[PDB]
């Protein structure tokens, strides 16, 4: 389902993918890559099946795509009703049913009343029965979060304001940690070990958010839907703690047991969540929390420290071409606009963990061209932003 | 002792000033204003005395200024020793006594050893006996605070990081509140009344810093050196709360019983203290507290809200020419650089609580000239800062 990568022959080892038969859409997506346009005369797809498996293989061969659905009480319809009401585009319930008469459900061929009742009973919307957005209802639509999740997000942030720990970045990370989902398979023993070795200030954040020690890779070590979601959020917030501490990905993998792809996926998800939480607090008139969260989206997107938050504005300074360029004295995009060209070439030549330097979207770049583009990007950034 | 304000005749009602005889330096300062240069031929000072008072009056007439002193264990010598050691200008104790051989005490004609011992026993300085600044010793010299006060300041900030209240500005104000000193005569009943009417979130900050209700304008209402310094800091932090809430000075005076001169003096002192605390946290590697405190110095210097923190950068927008200029849509020094000249003239003409507008250092300014200078200052600010 990703990038366009055609191959002359596509061999699909087994029709059973992950314990379940291969999806017909997935199978079509795979076999559509068989054959390079303008190079090959034909393209070949070979699905390797056997014995009984032969039946599922022939079903995939002769199958066709399933019809499209709507997926619309439900979270999607709640989101849609909130989106229209809070935007001011629809006010009366007659308009509310008119809107549902414009959806895919109306084209495929009660719920809106239930959605309006749920939004009214949860203080997302006020009734005068003209429906008007509240402050929480406006903040949910602004920070782009599901109204189902926004209730617990509001409760968590409101509890965090009452007591906050400013001597580390872990409390500002537990709030921007999205969830556990399935980003990794948490090892309980490993978690408990890390916990037994946290600073004298972390466990303060751990107990201020809900984590424990009697249930913190303990009971589950030798073997509750919210406490599981807290510890699996604490561990997740510990990993991000090492991501914003510029710990190398291999060290994070060794200490936590999660591979680098999972760590990168988690950091991207956490940066998205941090941006959403920042907007949510900004629209709610929470100035003492939005100010704290305003930098963690960048610090999680690039996995950096605060010092590099100005250097990573350059498109070619991710988290290691900016740290080696920061240690040499360049700590600001201003010092990098006139940064001696050949100098940054030498600095990028040093510290190796022709076009060896790889840039996202630029593929491989030679050291000289890489740092030349770095200084040019710094010049553009500081020149067009004022 | 203030500005140069000469008068033809200076009449000093009584030689007894504030229950004590008038200082000879103060008397000379008063009577030096008798006579305007280039206008009067002579100047007259008349000290009105009587009966016994006549003796103190004639003593003031025939008195002379006392000799200068040095005022240098003592807090001044501790400050001087810390200043030289942490600056790196002096390292060995031989150099430390050489420094004291350069002071006014050496010119007027043990202590340095006691000061070094006090700085060593309080972790301001490390001994290798070459003396080197620590992180706390470097942070004390950076944020310009007395090392005597910096210990309790460090303890208070360190306690605040563990538990902080971000849902109001009162916790960020209790840390930047200098002290009680004598800025006002606190009325206990009034204080207790205000306290009985605080938001459901203030008393959280009050109990997180040390304030109580059993002793909060209670016992002292019907009638301990630290609890007195906390409540007298809580009340002081409440007043500043109304100063940064843009409450009019007369309303603050009515609700708190402190006149406007005392309130302005307190707000200036608190802004100075906020700047010092911000630098102290900046040099200690406290990024989650320096970020919170980075705006309160301005918000206390001008007694404004956050929205006006960009408008008050203009020299002629204190806290009421910026609020009336903010309500009309100008919320940034960018919108005020091209702000229609005649438009801001009309806006300044409105909202009155020829040169009626008074500007600090510009004396009285006509509305047209005032807002013309306002837009010119905005242009200069946004033009020379990038
Ligand atoms: C909550 O918003 C986020 C902020 C940071 C990072 C991720 C998200 C996010 C996360 C999950 N799902 C969605 C979003 C999302 O992008 N929502 C957005 N809403 N507005 C945006 O700006 C676009 C824009 C701005 C101004 C104008 Cl005039 C027109 C368009 S982005
Ligand atoms: C703690 O510093 C404060 C900061 C804000 C407001 C009040 C104070 C304060 C309060 C009580 N006593 C003293 C101060 C004071 O100004 N100390 C200062 N130290 N350095 C400064 O900047 C001058 C400077 C800067 C850079 C160079 Cl290269 C040369 C000189 S000011």
Swiss-Prot record, chains A, B:
Disorder noted: Breast cancer: A common malignancy originating from breast epithelial tissue. Breast neoplasms can be distinguished by their histologic pattern. Invasive ductal carcinoma is by far the most common type. Breast cancer is etiologically and genetically heterogeneous. Important genetic factors have been indicated by familial occurrence and bilateral involvement. Mutations at more than one locus can be involved in different families or even in the same case.
Subcellular location field: Nucleus; Chromosome
Region annotation Interaction with RAD51: where it falls in the sequence: 354-386
Signal sequence bounds: none
Post-translational modification: Phosphorylated by PLK1; promoting interaction with TOPBP1 and recruitment to DNA damage sites.
Organism: Homo sapiens
Family of this protein: Belongs to the DNA polymerase type-A family.
Comment, domains: The loop 2 region is involved in the binding of the 2 ends of resected double-strand breaks and homomultimerization.
Phylogenetic placement of the source organism: Eukaryota, Metazoa, Chordata, Craniata, Vertebrata
Name of the molecule in the record: DNA polymerase theta
Function (record text): Low-fidelity DNA polymerase with a helicase activity that promotes microhomology-mediated end-joining (MMEJ), an alternative non-homologous end-joining (NHEJ) machinery required to repair double-strand breaks in DNA during mitosis. MMEJ is an error-prone repair pathway that produces deletions of sequences from the strand being repaired and promotes genomic rearrangements, such as telomere fusions, some of them leading to cellular transformation. MMEJ is required during mitosis to repair persistent double-strand breaks that originate in S-phase.
Subunit structure: Homomultimer; forms homodimers and homotetramers. Interacts with RAD51. Interacts with ORC2 and ORC4. Interacts with RHNO1; interaction takes place during mitosis and promotes POLQ recruitment to DNA damage sites. Interacts (when phosphorylated) with TOPBP1 (via BRCT domains 7 and 8); promoting POLQ recruitment to DNA damage sites.
Tissue occurrence: Highly expressed in testis.
